[PDB]
Subunit: 372 residues, 4 copies
């Protein structure tokens, strides 16, 4: 028996419920919708309507949310007017003992009846399994899709590695593997960065390449759009706070890029694995303000390659995801001071130090919950 | 006979002279090299050598240049440590009565023996010829090239027109046209923005499209890397001063994007035309830090769409290029106050205002030369 | 005989109308209150209350305001949510033909029944009279007041001249002078800059020193809080738009520091003079977050010394204030390119260029009224 | 025997040693001079000559310093081109077991022959002695001086407490106290902030009030210009790294305002005390870019009142200065997320988190020297 919770944060009126509730309803999944201060009241009605239609959906008011965060002594941890409020659902689903947490946006739509069943691969045991390795340490999950205009990389894929990646050796081998994170893919508008979207407005047409499980030492970015996490890894799945300036420019839109690398680094350290493939969602093409998305994403892009290079070198400690995550936060602070380059001004260094304190303030709430 | 001056600014040894002298020397072309402060002394030795071998090359000392500018009462117009120093070559070539000024980068190699002769297309006069018009006002000169990975747009091409551009209709009709700007294309690393370079890393394989002369009302960005300008249009070809911050971030790398749009706009006002196609140069793909290029171009890219929209609507006065350019400078200043959007903070608005003054200080310089 | 209009912008209740109204009503002077988008509607009640009670007050809506700025072709010249909207009062007052425009803040209250009559000193015409000069080119109007902790300088006084000022020689000659600006002083909280207020929180106990008329070449900042301008000078009294960044930090609180210097430099070019002294208002200590005031003024303060220096060496052209003001606006554009210092980054020079355009937009609006 | 080491970091020619070497040579004090990347080669000359006349002065090369910082595992702790290098002097003098470290600026000259001896008050122990308490929590050490124009506060004195401070009641009571920090005063140009120096340019003519020892809960800023620290307190005296932006603006010139408060807060936690009074140095008026000093200090000034207020409500832990300092670093991180106010942009909050990490890097290096 696998208890599953889907976490969404929305400032919509609740319409996404209509087409999203079926696959969760028929599967008996709980749906946590996290409203914000800028969430109009229609959302709450839409929930009680769908609860009446058989879906186990809850939707805690901001006042409820803040009460919980206040009792766990993390009152300022999670801002309002942010999709950071994600973290509230992660915490609630974990508090309540769910095995599988599925992180979604309110615009992603499952495309198959077995959406929940497939994300439950993260509840498989360890298995001798085909594992996918790349000579250069990276795997491009968009390679599993038919993408119309031209080949593309996912958002958060490092840039320095892209030119040579196509010449890298990809190998499949049977090894023991214990999947704890399932990153399901997306059709229509795929999770590419604002650079790529602006340059080729790609269209993901089909899921053609199956699924994969990345060998130790092979990484690919994991987003929070269509992603199952096993309850043991949830401590390392903290969605990072955006807004910190790099060279004076505030970063946005990369909170789940850090999180999807962090949970992934921790998992490998603990002998666990990340899977990419089904189930796939439908991500509609939002067509809003691509130049603004670029302006938001550039500060993080200017830092990520260096942060990812330094994480490889850095050995971690811990015997579960909380301890390893805490050790990681200290490593980021050592990296914040060791890294070098034009993007690394005082505010850019300081962004790491603040993020590390917020990561331990998060685990600290998980301990308070657990009496640790 | 038609007299031509190639203008190149550089901070290098002069080794580029070796593969660039042949075409110039055999045509009797003048090569103006603008050295900078951060320019080693090898270059000056390199020129004297090639001069001895027959190439009519000149290499005015920083001290020479600065005396010209003082004597013209524009001592602060042209910054140091910047490829803005092209402008001295432009001025020197104008001052000495050259018919055709070709703007180049020190790293662009001619690929044919009649390089100079082809750029003299700007010296044929008006005639009825095949003219190319687009239903959306834009032409994509990169479509005249076979580009390796996927279709691309040139640097400076507005972003709001890209998605729909493939659906515009293109017509070729016999109209009178007076070509005064010839933007030759590039094999290798084509002139795309940082966004496009990062996303697809395009390779320009061949110039298979022939040449086009853009109808009135159809525009395409014009760069300063492989571009001939008839001396009457030179006064509107001032390479814009970069470094003005947009919302805090200093813009760079777009001096010729504004200059190419400004000389085009003035040309069409005066009933002249821009040609795209041959002669072709090879542009070697030496990238280094693409992410820094991106950080530099984004501030200009955030304003350019709006600047272009207001330029389509803004009627200009003037009978020659100098009159029309000054009228454009005042138009930019009206636009600075009418435009609206998230990117148009006070420092973005003031950018246009200081550019406008710089533009008229340049034309004041040319006026002084011509009044004496 | 002499028509007088007072000009005040306010986001208040209209409460100040209370006690400000007497001195103006008995003198039958027009009071023009310019409300803003962020102003209360209680204000308009106050207005027509007094209009019954005998005071010729007129406080027009944002819409009438915008109607006029539209009919004068300057619909973007005066922003909202900013005391810059004084300028609407200046223009209306000029338009209607008042002889004497008195600029006030809504927290300054006359202290004598002759308030309007003392400000009318500006319609005396040329008459031989005592005139004061300082060998260093500066006069400290605060030395006309008794100030509580120690000696102070008015806001806008150049910092480089402060240490030596006590050793400058002051001299008085009787000579012909035509007073067109009357800058009356302040008791209670004197108009000092944020630096001074923070350091010594001065209190101006009395007006001990009588009045002075400054000789040509002798300057002192003039504010818009208790300052009478003669109709002919009002063209040059345009209140400068704040908000431009200097090194990324936007300036504020100095719109009238520039206008007071600009009207003054124009006046002296035309052979007119500035007076300081009676009538005295009371300015209540409303010290509201002095550190914020400091953070706002510092950008402007880092430029002003250099601006005043270059203004001394820049001779102007014009036969009236409009012409001279426009000549000034162009001098500033030269100065913006000639000056040097660490504060003179690209956005700080662009401040001068956008301001010059805004000043010529203001004179263009008045030309429109007059038929140039 | 009481061993004393004076620490100075300089970029000067070494001329200051003429007027400093006597009072220290006479006392057999060691003088540690920390040069920087940008220190002339003359300064090394000066040191060698001054040792030839008996001054035990040492001037370690930047290569020498960097070897020690690498061996302590802190190669990146202390930047170059910064008076932060002070810290190297503290570390060297603490390593060598000096009882008393006297932190100086290279332009602070002793006015008495008992300079060293007087600073040795820090090495007498606890005893019952006159102890000064203030009803408001603050003591203005400049009140011990005769100041020429008017009353002033020292650099780093909170701004909210200044208006009401003259109304505070001060008492002197016999109480046990243990003086571990001695802040000697300054004649000539007192240690004022840029605000004050610009406003009134104070001249400190005499030391008239004797010396005081502050009761628990009464604070006053302590600078690093003329300040003796006992051995045990040096771990808490790390001179804080400047350069972090507050709302885009880099803070500077306040490294010792923080250190002076951090050491003071640790001292009182440990039941130790701060002294103000003799001995006195002459601080010659330097007069250099005061508007730049102001631009540099304002960002720190915008945060300091809030930090101090939060420090009063934050209980610490530790049984020595290392432990108490590390405890303080963690309290700053909590404060960084609790404080509220306009200046508290993300970069300003992250400023505290990066500082705390550098504080713990500094204590870590001290622990490595001690094997603890
Ligand atoms: N709590 C909260 N959620 C938000 C906010 N803004 C966006 N979201 C949620 O974020 C998710 C998708 O965000 P979006 O901005 O549409 O990014 P895009 O699809 O990658 O371009 C959806 O679940 C939205 O409801 C906000 O201010 N507060
Ligand atoms: N005067 C001057 N020229 C420069 C400077 N930096 C680069 N250049 C020249 O600028 C032109 C192209 O520069 P590059 O950085 O190679 O960019 P790319 O045009 O995008 O390939 C070449 O002619 C260089 O010689 C500089 O600081 N001063
Ligand atoms: N129209 C308008 N007037 C304002 C605004 N803010 C302040 N004022 C006016 O500013 C005047 C007083 O100046 P203030 O900036 O408040 O402080 P002070 O310069 O230190 O005296 C009053 O007459 C207010 O009505 C605003 O947003 N819009
Ligand atoms: N190592 C180092 N020391 C510096 C630097 N700039 C100033 N100092 C030292 O700082 C001390 C005081 O410097 P000063 O410029 O006089 O600042 P002020 O007294 O606060 O106005 C002197 O001993 C200088 O030698 C620097 O870049 N590197
Ligand atoms: Mg989405
Ligand atoms: Mg598993
Ligand atoms: Mg993720
Ligand atoms: Mg190049
Ligand atoms: Mg032609
Ligand atoms: Mg050009
Ligand atoms: Mg006020
Ligand atoms: Mg008169
Ligand atoms: Mg004024
Ligand atoms: Mg000094
Ligand atoms: Mg100190």
């Amino acid at each position: 028996d696998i208890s599953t919770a889907v976490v969404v944060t929305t400032i919509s009126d609740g319409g996404f419920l209509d087409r999203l509730a079926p696959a969760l309803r028929d599967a008996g999944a709980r749906l946590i919708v996290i409203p914000d201060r800028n969430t109009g009241p229609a959302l709450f009605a839409a929930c009680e309507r769908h609860r009446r239609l058989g879906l186990d959906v809850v939707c805690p008011s901001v006042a409820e949310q803040q009460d919980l965060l206040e009792r766990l002594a993390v009152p300022d941890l999670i801002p309002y007017h942010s999709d950071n409020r994600r973290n509230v659902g992660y915490l609630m689903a974990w508090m309540e003992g769910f095995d599988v947490i599925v992180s979604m946006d309110d615009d992603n739509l499952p495309t198959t009846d077995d959406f929940v069943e497939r994300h439950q691969v993260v509840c498989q045991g360890p298995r001798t399994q085909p594992v996918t390795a790349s000579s250069d340490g990276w795997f491009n999950n968009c390679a599993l899709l038919e993408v119309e205009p031209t080949e593309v990389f996912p958002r958060g894929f490092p840039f320095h590695a892209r030119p040579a990646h196509a010449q890298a050796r990809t190998s499949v081998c049977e090894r023991p593997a214990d999947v704890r994170i399932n990153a399901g893919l997306w059709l229509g508008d795929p999770d590419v960065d604002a650079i790529t979207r602006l340059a080729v407005r790609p269209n993901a047409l089909a899921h053609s390449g199956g699924s994969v499980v990345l060998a130790e030492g092979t990484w690919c970015p994991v987003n929070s759009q269509n992603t199952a996490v096993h309850r043991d890894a949830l401590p390392a799945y903290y969605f990072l706070r955006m807004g910190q300036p790099v060279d004076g420019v505030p970063m946005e839109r990369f909170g789940d890029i850090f999180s999807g690398y962090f949970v992934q680094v921790c998992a490998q350290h603990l002998g666990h694995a990340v899977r990419f493939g089904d189930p796939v969602v439908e991500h509609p093409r939002n067509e809003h303000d691509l130049l603004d998305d670029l302006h938001k994403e550039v500060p993080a892009v200017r830092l990520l390659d260096d942060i990812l290079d330094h994480l490889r070198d850095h050995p971690l400690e811990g015997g579960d995801y909380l301890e390893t995550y805490e050790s990681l936060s200290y490593a980021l602070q050592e990296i914040a001071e060791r890294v070098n380059g034009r993007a690394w001004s005082p505010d850019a260094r300081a962004f790491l130090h603040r993020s590390a304190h917020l990561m331990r303030s998060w685990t600290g709430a998980l301990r308070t919950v657990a009496g640790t």
